[PDB]
mmCIF file with all atom_site columns, C-alpha atoms (C1' of nucleotides) and ligand atoms in Angstrom:
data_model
loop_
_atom_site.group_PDB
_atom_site.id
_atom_site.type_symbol
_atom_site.label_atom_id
_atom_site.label_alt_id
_atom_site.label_comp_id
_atom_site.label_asym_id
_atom_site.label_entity_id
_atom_site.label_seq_id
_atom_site.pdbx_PDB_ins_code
_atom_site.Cartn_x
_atom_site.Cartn_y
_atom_site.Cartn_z
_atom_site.occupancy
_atom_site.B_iso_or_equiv
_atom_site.pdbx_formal_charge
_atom_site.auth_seq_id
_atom_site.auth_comp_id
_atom_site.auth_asym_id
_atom_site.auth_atom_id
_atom_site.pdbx_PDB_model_num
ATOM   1   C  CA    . UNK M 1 1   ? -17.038 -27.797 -110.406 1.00 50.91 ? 1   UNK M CA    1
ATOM   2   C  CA    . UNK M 1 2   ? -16.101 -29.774 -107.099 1.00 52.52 ? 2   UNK M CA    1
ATOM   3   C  CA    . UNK M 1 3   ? -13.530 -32.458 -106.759 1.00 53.39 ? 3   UNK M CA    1
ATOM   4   C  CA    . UNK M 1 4   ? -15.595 -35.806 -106.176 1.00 55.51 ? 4   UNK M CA    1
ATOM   5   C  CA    . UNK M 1 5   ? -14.260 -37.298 -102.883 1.00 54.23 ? 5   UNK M CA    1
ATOM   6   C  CA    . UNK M 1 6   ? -15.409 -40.350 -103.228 1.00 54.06 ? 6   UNK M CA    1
ATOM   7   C  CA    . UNK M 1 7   ? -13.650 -41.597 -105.896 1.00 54.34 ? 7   UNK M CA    1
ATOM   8   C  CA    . UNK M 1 8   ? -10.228 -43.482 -106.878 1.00 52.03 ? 8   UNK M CA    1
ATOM   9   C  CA    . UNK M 1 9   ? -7.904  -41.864 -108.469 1.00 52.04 ? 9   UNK M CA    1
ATOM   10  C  CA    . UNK M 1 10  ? -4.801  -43.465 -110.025 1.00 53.51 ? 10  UNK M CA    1
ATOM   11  C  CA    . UNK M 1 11  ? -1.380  -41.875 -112.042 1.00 51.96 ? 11  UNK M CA    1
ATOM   12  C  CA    . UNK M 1 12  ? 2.233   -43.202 -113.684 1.00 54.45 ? 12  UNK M CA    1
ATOM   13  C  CA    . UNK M 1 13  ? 5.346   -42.771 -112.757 1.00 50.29 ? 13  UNK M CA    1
ATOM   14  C  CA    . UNK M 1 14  ? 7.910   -42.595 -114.684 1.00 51.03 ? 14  UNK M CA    1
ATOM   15  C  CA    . UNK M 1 15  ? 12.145  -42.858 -114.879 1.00 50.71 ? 15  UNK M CA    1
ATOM   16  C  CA    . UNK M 1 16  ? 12.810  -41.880 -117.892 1.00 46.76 ? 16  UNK M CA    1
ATOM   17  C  CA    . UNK M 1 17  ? 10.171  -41.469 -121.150 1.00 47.75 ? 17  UNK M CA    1
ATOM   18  C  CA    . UNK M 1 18  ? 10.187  -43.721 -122.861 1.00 47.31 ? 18  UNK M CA    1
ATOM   19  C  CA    . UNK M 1 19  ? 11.944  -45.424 -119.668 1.00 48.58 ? 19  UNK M CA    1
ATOM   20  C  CA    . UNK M 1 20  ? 11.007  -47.141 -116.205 1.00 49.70 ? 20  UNK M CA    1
ATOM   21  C  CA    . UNK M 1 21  ? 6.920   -47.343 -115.845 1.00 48.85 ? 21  UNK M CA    1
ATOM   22  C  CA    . UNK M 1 22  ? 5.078   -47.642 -112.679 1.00 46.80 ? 22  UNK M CA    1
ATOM   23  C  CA    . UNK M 1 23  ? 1.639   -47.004 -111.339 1.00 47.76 ? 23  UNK M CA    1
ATOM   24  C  CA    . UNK M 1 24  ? -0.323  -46.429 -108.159 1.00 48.42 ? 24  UNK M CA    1
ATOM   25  C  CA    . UNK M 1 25  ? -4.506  -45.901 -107.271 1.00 47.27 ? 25  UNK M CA    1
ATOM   26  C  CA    . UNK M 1 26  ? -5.014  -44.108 -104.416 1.00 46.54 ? 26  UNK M CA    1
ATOM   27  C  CA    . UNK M 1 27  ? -8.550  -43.206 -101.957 1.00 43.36 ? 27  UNK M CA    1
ATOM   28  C  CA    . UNK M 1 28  ? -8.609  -39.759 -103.446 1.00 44.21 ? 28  UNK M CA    1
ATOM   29  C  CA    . UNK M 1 29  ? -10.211 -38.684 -99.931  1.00 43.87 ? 29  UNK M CA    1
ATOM   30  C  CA    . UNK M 1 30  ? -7.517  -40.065 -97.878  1.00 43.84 ? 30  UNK M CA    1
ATOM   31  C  CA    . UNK M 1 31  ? -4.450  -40.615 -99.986  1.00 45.06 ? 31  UNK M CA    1
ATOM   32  C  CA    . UNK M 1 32  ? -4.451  -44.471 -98.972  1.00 45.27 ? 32  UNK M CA    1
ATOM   33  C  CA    . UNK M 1 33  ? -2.275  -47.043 -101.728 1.00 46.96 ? 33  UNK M CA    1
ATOM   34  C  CA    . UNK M 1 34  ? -4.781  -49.344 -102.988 1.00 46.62 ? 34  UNK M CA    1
ATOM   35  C  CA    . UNK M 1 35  ? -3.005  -50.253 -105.438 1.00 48.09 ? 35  UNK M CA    1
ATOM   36  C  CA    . UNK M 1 36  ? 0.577   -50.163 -107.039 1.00 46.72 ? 36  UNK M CA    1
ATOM   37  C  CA    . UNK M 1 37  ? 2.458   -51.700 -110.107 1.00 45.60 ? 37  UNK M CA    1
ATOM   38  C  CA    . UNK M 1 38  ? 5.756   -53.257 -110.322 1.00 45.75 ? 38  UNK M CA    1
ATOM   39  C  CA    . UNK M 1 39  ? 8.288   -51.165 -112.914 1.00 45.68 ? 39  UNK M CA    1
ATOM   40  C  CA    . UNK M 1 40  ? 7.842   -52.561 -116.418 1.00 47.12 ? 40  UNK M CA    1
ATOM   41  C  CA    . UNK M 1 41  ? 11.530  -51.637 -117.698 1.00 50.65 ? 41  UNK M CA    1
ATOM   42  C  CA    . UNK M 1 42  ? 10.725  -49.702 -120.664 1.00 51.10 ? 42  UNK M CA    1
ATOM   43  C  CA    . UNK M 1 43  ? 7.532   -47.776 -121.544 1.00 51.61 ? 43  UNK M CA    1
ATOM   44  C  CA    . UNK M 1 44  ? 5.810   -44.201 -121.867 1.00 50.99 ? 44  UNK M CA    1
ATOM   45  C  CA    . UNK M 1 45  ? 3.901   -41.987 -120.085 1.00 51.21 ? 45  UNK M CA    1
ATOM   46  C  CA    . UNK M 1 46  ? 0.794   -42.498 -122.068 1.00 49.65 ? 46  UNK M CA    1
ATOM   47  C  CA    . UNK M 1 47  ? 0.862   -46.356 -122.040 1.00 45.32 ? 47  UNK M CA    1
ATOM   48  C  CA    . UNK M 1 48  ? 1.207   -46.507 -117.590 1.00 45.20 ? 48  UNK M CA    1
ATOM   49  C  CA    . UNK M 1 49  ? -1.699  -43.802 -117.427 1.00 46.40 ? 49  UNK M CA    1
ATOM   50  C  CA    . UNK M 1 50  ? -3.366  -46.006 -119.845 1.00 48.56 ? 50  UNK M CA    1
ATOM   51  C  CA    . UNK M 1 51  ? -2.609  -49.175 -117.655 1.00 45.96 ? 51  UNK M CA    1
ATOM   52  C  CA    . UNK M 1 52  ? -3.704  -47.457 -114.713 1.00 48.35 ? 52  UNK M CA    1
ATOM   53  C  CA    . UNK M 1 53  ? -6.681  -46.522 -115.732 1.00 47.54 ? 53  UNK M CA    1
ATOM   54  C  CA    . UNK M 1 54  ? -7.909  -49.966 -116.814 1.00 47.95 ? 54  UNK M CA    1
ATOM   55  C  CA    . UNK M 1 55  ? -6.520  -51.862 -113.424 1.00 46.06 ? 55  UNK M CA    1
ATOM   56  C  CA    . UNK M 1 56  ? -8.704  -49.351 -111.694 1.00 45.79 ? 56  UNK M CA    1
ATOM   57  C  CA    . UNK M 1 57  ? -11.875 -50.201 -113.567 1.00 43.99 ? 57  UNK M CA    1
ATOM   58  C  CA    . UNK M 1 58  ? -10.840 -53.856 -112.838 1.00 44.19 ? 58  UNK M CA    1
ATOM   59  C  CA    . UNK M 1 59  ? -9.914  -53.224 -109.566 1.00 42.63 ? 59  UNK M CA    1
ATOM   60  C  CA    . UNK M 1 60  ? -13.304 -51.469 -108.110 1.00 44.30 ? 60  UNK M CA    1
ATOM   61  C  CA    . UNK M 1 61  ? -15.335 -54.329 -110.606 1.00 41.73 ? 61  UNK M CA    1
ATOM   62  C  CA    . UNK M 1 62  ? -14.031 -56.882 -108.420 1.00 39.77 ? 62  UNK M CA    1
ATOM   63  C  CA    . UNK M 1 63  ? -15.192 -54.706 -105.343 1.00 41.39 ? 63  UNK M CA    1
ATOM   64  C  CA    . UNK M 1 64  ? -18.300 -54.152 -106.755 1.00 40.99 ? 64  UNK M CA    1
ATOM   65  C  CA    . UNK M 1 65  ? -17.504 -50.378 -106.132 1.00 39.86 ? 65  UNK M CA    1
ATOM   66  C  CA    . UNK M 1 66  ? -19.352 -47.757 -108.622 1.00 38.83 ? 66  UNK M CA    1
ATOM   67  C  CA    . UNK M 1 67  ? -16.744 -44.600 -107.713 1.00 40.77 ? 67  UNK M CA    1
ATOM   68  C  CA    . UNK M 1 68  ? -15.350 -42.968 -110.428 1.00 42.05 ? 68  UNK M CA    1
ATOM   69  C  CA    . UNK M 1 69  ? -11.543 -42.903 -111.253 1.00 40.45 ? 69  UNK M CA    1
ATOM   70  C  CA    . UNK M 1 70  ? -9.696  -39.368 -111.737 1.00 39.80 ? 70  UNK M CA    1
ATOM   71  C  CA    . UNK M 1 71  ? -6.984  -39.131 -114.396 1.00 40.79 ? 71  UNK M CA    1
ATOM   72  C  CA    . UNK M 1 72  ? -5.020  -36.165 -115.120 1.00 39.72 ? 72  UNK M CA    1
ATOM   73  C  CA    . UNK M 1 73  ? -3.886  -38.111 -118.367 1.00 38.52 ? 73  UNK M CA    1
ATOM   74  C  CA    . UNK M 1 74  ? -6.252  -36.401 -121.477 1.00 37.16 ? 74  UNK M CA    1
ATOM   75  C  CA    . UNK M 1 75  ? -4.707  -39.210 -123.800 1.00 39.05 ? 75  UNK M CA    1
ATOM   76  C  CA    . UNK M 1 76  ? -4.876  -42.471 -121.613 1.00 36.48 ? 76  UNK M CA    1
ATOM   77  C  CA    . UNK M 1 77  ? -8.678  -41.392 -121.059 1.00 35.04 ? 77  UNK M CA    1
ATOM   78  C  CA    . UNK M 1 78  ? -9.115  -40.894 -124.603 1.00 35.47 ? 78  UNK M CA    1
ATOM   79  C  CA    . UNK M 1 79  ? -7.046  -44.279 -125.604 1.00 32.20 ? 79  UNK M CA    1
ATOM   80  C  CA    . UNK M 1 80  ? -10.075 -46.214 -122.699 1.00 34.16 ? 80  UNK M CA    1
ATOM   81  C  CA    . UNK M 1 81  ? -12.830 -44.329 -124.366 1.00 32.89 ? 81  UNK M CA    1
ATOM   82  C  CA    . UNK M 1 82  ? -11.645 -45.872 -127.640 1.00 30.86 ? 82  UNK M CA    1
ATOM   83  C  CA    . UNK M 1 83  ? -10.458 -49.316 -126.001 1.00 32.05 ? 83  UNK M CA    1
ATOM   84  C  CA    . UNK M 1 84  ? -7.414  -48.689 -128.323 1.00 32.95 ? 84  UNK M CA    1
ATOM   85  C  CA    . UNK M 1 85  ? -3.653  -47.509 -127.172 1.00 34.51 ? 85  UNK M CA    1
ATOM   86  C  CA    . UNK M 1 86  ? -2.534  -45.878 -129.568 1.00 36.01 ? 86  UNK M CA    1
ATOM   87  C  CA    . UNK M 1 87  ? 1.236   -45.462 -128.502 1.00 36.95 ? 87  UNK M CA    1
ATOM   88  C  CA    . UNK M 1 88  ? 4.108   -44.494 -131.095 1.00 34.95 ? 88  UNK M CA    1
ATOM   89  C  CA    . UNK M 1 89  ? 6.457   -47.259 -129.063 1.00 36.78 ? 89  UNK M CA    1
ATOM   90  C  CA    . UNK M 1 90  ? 8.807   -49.216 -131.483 1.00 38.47 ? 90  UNK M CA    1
ATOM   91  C  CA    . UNK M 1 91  ? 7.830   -52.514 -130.601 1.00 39.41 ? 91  UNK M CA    1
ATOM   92  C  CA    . UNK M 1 92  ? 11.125  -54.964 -130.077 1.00 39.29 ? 92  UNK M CA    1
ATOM   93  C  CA    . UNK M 1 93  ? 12.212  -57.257 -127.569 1.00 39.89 ? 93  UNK M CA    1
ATOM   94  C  CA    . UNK M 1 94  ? 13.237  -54.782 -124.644 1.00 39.43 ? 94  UNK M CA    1
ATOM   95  C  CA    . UNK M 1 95  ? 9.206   -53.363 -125.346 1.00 39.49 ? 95  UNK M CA    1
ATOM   96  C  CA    . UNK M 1 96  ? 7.619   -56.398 -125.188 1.00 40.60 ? 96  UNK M CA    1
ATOM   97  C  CA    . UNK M 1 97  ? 6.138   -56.376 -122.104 1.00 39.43 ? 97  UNK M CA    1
ATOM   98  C  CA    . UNK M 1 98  ? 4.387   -53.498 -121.660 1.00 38.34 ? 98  UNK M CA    1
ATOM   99  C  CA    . UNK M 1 99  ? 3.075   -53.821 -124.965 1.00 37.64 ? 99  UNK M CA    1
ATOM   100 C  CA    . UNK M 1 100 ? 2.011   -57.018 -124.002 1.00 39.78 ? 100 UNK M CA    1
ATOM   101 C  CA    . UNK M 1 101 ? 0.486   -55.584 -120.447 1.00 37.80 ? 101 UNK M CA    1
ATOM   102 C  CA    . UNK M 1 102 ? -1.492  -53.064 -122.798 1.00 36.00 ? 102 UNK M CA    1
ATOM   103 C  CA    . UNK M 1 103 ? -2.730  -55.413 -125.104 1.00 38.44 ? 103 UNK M CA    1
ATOM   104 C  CA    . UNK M 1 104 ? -4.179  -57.563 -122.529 1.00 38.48 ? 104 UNK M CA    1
ATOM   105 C  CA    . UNK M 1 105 ? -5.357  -54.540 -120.935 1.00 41.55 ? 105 UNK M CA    1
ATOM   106 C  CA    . UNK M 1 106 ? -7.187  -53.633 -124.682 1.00 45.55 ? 106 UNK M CA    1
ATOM   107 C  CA    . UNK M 1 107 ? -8.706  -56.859 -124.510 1.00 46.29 ? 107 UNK M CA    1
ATOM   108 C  CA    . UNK M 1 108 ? -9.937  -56.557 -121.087 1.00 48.55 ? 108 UNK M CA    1
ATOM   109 C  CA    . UNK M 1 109 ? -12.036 -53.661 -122.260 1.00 48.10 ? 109 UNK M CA    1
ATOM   110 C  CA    . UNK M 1 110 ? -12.710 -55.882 -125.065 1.00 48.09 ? 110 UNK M CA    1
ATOM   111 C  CA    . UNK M 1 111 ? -14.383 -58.512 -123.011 1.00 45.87 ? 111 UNK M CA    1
ATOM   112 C  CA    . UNK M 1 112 ? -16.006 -56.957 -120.527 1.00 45.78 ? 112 UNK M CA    1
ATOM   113 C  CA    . UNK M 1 113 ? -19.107 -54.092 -119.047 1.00 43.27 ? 113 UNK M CA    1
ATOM   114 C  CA    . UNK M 1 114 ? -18.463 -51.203 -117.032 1.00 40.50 ? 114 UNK M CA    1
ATOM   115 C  CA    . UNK M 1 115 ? -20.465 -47.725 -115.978 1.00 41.12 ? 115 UNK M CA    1
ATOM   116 C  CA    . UNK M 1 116 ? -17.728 -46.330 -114.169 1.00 37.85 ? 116 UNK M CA    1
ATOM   117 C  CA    . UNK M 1 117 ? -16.779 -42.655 -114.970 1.00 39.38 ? 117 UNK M CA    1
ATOM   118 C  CA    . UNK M 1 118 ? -13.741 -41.523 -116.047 1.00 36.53 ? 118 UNK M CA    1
ATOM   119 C  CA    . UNK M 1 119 ? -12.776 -38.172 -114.913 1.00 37.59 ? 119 UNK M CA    1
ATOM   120 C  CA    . UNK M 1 120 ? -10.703 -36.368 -115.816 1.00 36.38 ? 120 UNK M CA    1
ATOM   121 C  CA    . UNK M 1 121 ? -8.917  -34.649 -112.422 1.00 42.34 ? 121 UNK M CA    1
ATOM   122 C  CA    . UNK M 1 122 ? -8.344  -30.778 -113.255 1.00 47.05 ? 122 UNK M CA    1
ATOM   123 C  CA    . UNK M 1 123 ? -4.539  -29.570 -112.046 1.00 44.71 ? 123 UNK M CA    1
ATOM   124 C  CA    . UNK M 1 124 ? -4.999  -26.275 -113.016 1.00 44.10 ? 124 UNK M CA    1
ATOM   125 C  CA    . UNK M 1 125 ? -7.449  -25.818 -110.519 1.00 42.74 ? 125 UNK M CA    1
ATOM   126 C  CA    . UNK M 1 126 ? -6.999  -28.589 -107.745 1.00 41.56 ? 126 UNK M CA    1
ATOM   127 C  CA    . UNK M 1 127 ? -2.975  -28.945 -107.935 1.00 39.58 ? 127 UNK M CA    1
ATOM   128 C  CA    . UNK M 1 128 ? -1.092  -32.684 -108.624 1.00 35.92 ? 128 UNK M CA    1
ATOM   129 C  CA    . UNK M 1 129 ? -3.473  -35.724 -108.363 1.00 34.63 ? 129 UNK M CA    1
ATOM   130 C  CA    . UNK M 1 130 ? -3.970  -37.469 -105.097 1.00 36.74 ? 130 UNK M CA    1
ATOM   131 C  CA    . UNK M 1 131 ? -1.629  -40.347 -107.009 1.00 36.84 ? 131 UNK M CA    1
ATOM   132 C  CA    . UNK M 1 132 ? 1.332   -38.550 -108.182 1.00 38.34 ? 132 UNK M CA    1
ATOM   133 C  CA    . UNK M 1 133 ? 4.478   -39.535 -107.445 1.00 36.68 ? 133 UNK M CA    1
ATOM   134 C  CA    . UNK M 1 134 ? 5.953   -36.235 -106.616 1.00 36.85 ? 134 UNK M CA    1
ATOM   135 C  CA    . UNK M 1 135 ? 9.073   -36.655 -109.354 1.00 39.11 ? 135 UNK M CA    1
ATOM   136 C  CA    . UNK M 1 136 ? 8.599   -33.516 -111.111 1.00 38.94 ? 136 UNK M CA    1
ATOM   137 C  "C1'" . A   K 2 1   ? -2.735  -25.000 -128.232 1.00 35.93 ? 1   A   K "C1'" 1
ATOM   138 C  "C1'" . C   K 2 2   ? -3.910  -28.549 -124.686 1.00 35.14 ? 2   C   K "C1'" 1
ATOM   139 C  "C1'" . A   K 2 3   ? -3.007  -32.760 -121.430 1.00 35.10 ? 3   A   K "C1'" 1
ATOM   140 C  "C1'" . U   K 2 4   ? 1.019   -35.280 -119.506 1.00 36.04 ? 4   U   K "C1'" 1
ATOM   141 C  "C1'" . DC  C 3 1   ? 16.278  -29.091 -121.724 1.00 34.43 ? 1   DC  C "C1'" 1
ATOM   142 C  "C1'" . DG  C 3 2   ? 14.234  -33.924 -123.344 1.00 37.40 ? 2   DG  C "C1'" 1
ATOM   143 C  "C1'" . DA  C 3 3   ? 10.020  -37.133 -124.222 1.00 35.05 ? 3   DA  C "C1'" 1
ATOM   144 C  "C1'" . DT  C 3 4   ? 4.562   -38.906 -125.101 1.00 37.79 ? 4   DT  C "C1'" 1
ATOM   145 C  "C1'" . DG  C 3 5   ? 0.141   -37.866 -126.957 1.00 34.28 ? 5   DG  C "C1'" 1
ATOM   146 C  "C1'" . DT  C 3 6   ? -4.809  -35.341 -129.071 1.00 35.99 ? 6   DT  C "C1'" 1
HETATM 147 K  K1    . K   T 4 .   ? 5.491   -36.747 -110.345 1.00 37.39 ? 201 K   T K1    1
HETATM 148 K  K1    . K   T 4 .   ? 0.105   -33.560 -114.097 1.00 38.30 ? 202 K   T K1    1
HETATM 149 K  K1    . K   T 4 .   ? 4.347   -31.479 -127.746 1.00 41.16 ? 203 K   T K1    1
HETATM 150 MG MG1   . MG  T 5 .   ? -0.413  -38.354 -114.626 1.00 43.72 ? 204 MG  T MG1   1
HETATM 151 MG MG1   . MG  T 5 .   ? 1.989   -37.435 -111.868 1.00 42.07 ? 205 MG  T MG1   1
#
RNA sequence: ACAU
DNA sequence: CGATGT
């Protein structure tokens, strides 16, 4: 089982969880940005994998790109399989946003057609994803 | 347990 | 040490 070079791969960063959520996509070959996400002031883990996920399937649609996106995240691949995040986050007024971010992202998957694979990228065996943020 |  | 998730 071979890493797939040719690929995007994306991950969240976090300050705090439930805190500060960001996200980057990255040329898995190269390590080259292609892609980053303002902080969203309050969210989890699970919801900025989840978010990072979609905006790379949205992302290479536009490019008319058929690579596959790595994810270390087991859950935020799950929650795309499903086209349903299913995140424990109280919703109030200081959650609002990503909630609403993931919600549009649901009904993205909702609305639209995609064969891109969803891999999941294996740390045990390959260290930290091309995308992580090097925080831990 | 496993994945973050 | 705490948290998010299956
Ligand atoms: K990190
Ligand atoms: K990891
Ligand atoms: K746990
Ligand atoms: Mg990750
Ligand atoms: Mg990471």
């Amino acid at each position: 089982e071979e890493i797939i070079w040719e690929s995007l791969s994306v991950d969240v960063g976090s300050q705090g969880n439930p805190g500060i959520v960001e996200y980057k996509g990255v040329d898995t070959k190269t390590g080259e940005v292609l892609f980053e996400r303002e902080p969203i002031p309050i969210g989890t883990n699970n919801m900025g994998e989840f978010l990072a996920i979609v905006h790379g399937l949205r992302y290479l649609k536009e490019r008319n790109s058929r690579k596959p996106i790595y994810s270390d995240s087991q859950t935020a691949i799950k929650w795309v399989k499903d086209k349903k995040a299913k995140s424990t986050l109280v919703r109030n007024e200081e959650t609002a946003l990503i909630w609403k971010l993931v919600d549009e992202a649901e009904e993205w998957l909702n609305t639209h057609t995609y064969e891109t694979p969803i891999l999941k990228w294996q740390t045990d065996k390959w260290g930290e994803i091309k995308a992580d943020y090097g925080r831990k």
